[PDB]
Amino acid sequence: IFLNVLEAIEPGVVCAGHDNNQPDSFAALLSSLNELGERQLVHVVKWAKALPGFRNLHVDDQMAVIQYSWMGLMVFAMGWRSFTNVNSRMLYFAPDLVFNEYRMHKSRMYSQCVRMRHLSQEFGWLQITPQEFLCMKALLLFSIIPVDGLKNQKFFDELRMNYIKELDRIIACSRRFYQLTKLLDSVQPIARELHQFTFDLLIKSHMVSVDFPEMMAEIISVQVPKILSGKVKPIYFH
Numbered sequence: 001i002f003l004n005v006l007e008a009i010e011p012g013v014v015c016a017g018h019d020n021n022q023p024d025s026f027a028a029l030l031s032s033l034n035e036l037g038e039r040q041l042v043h044v045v046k047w048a049k050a051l052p053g054f055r056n057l058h059v060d061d062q063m064a065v066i067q068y069s070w071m072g073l074m075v076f077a078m079g080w081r082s083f084t085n086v087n088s089r090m091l092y093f094a095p096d097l098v099f100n101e102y103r104m105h106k107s108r109m110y111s112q113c114v115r116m117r118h119l120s121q122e123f124g125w126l127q128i129t130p131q132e133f134l135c136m137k138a139l140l141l142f143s144i145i146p147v148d149g150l151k152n153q154k155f156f157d158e159l160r161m162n163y164i165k166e167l168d169r170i171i172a173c174s175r176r177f178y179q180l181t182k183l184l185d186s187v188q189p190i191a192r193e194l195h196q197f198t199f200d201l202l203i204k205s206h207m208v209s210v211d212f213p214e215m216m217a218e219i220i221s222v223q224v225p226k227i228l229s230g231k232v233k234p235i236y237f238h
């Protein structure tokens with residue numbers, strides 16, 4: 001039942017709308033990454049709200065958890081698409097936004113990109129199954145919380161425990177749980193580097209001709225700094 005649901009709500013293909021017939025430029029690549037990010041967020045929200053037990057969470061906690069986990073969720077799913085679509089040869093942000101090393105360099109996010117390429121390869125090396133991937137991704141949504149707590153922390157703790165239990169069931173074991181939780185933890189540092197980069201970019205966006213969508217700018221200026229300043233932190237297994 002649980003896996004049937006995860007499979008049923010998994011988002012379909014999302015395109016960036018990037019002009020690939022134009023020579024690569026920092027400004028156009030980032031504007032497409034921003035637009036793609038916002039298009040994906042629409043889907044992440046619909047996906048999250050359809051998750052088993054997600055409605056149990058307080059209304060305000062639902063929005064917060066989605067906004068904080070947004071980057072991580074995208075990173076994890078992008079790594080999977082890279083592995084399944086191009087065997088980690090490139091980063092498959094979208095069918096019309098595929099990064100080769102040249103674009104990784106031109107985007108000024110080279111180190112983060114190489115770490116995501118390594119993540120992509122890990123899916124292959126660890127032989128992650130589509131079902132482990134689905135459960136792990138859902139678990140990522142419940143892996144970052146505020147130090148001062150959510151409106152209903154207890155409901156959040158129960159839900160996270162339940163998702164961990166589902167992972168146990170998919171696995172069923174110890175060595176595998178170790179491998180998967182280590183892989184999950186590796187997502188956070190990458191999301192952090194992307195958050196930092198994105199934060200710095202928005203602050204100087206007017207200096208590099210980068211276009212930030214309304215909702216994204218609000219989230220980067222209101223939520224992301226809570227993560228960067230240590231007020232909101234990820235939950236690591238290790």
Ligand SMILES: C[C@](O)(COc1ccc(F)cc1)C(=O)Nc1ccc([N+](=O)[O-])c(C(F)(F)F)c1
Nearest residue numbers: 033034036037070071074075078093194198220
């Ligand atoms: C630069 C940026 O547009 C910033 O997007 C944000 C995403 C979340 C957030 F809280 C703040 C900004 C970005 O990283 N976009 C992006 C778009 C798509 C994907 N993707 O499809 O996986 C990613 C990725 F997760 F890879 F890094 C990143």
